Amino acid sequence: MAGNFWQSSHYLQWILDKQDLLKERQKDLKFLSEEEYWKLQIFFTNVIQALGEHLKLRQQVIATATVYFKRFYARYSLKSIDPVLMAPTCVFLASKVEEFGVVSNTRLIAAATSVLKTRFSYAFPKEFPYRMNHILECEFYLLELMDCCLIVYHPYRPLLQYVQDMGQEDMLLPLAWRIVNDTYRTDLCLLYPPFMIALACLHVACVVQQKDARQWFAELSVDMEKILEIIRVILKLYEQWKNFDERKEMATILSKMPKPKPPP
Amino acid sequence: SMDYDFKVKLSSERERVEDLFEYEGCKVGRGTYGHVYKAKRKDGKDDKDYALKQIEGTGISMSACREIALLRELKHPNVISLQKVFLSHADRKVWLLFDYAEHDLWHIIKFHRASKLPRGMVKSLLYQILDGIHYLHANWVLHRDLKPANILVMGEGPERGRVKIADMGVTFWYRAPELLLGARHYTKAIDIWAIGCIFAELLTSEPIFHCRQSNPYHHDQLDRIFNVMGFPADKDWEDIKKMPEHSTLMKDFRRNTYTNCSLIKYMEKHKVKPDSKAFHLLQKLLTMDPIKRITSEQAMQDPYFLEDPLPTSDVFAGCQIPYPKREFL
């Protein structure tokens, strides 16, 4: 699949208003601060990233799984479904959509158990508690509450088209691609079209590597106001990165997070 | 694991297929894809016929995933339209809802060859197949298995005569020769060969490469392609040497066996003039070399669709439909 973004379910249903997102978030903001909430989103982004790395999945599969996770918690509370169960479920569903196949029961559970044990022991003292019956249940809820919107468009594809158009695919692409992976620590994928995130990442990459791309950028006819809005978020994300000690803070932030209520 | 109040609210508000539609004993289709039912709304809001596709297996399979993912994005008059998705939590079965197409090419062809096809209808069917596949190909979507049973034709109603391309995910009569020779990947030309196979079947009422019933190499099917087409010369398909099953082809076959075999001779026996615009388009679709096969956009621009009669939006062209309604299995 590689269709027009303006006719996609991604644009027509999953490009949200920054204020609608904040209003839906207010349910969880009674337990966690605005700061603690974006730290928790970074944490699970990095959890999905470690899951995809372990399973040897391409960056597109990892990114599709990230967007699913972010999309679900944009409409629902962190207590509705445990994010520790949502993270491997998203990875499982995105692997099927992106044509990478069905991760087996034993391969998926072992990946979730190992990743949390060897890479997230600072936040999780107990072993991964869920089994395949939990993933398969969560999968049905995830598919239902996303209105069956499975095709996700990412900034990686237009970014490669932009760098190739510049004739700087060797110099700029490694850094710009890395900056794109980092946007998954923010809500940009829920607010702006992918090509726009790719242009802002390429702009930050040109600034870091000190390259005059002003001419190329001026011959685009894109809303540079919206590109500047994304740049500020990218710049802000690195300052957030500096002041956030994931390993020292996550145990307390996960304890503050609302948990699923059991039946009476 | 999951909030009680969240689960309870969703269960109370979830629309269940059995509450919305009556389909018990209404099965009209069966296959690898799953089962199809001719259903009616339980709430009398509509008297319209609907198609309910119950997918094969528990949970969401690769075929169910691929069909939901694509049909949710694809909007074309010649591609089947997904109206709703039902996730039956009780038995973990996936249901897909569409508008009911009364006919398909499998049944239309079956009716005609049983008698033993109007040429305006054949041209109209083909232009709508090429139109629908051109849209899919423009969105980098491949059918992978085009056959008459997938080319649905709408019956009486607001969309009379409209072709709908269905199914997104035993018989190799529509499989391109490069697949039969071990080509690992699916390509646009593989879909084009299939359309060429369908077009020959609509023009003659017989499957051009009919063959008697897990490796990619199917000797009997390739033999039938060469009895119709003739053995490909080096000049005709230069990369035949690059095929994984080329050594097997050289071991099992001899160019001499199909010396008096050509598409001209085959089509002539079924009363299709080799100098007609229909034949020349068919030969461009049925090209052995995939890189030498015409595209859907180039096929739609063919002077065949400019010749009398022009293709129509209603393939039947307002004439009474002779084909019977689908029987309940």
Ligand SMILES: CN(C)C(=O)Cn1cc(-c2ccc(-c3cncc4ccccc34)cc2)cn1
């Ligand atoms: C073993 N045999 C002999 C068979 O299955 C006989 N058969 C039945 C069919 C068939 C049944 C239903 C539809 C259909 C109709 N309307 C809308 C649809 C939407 C999505 C999928 C299918 C449809 C199309 C074909 C073909 N062949």
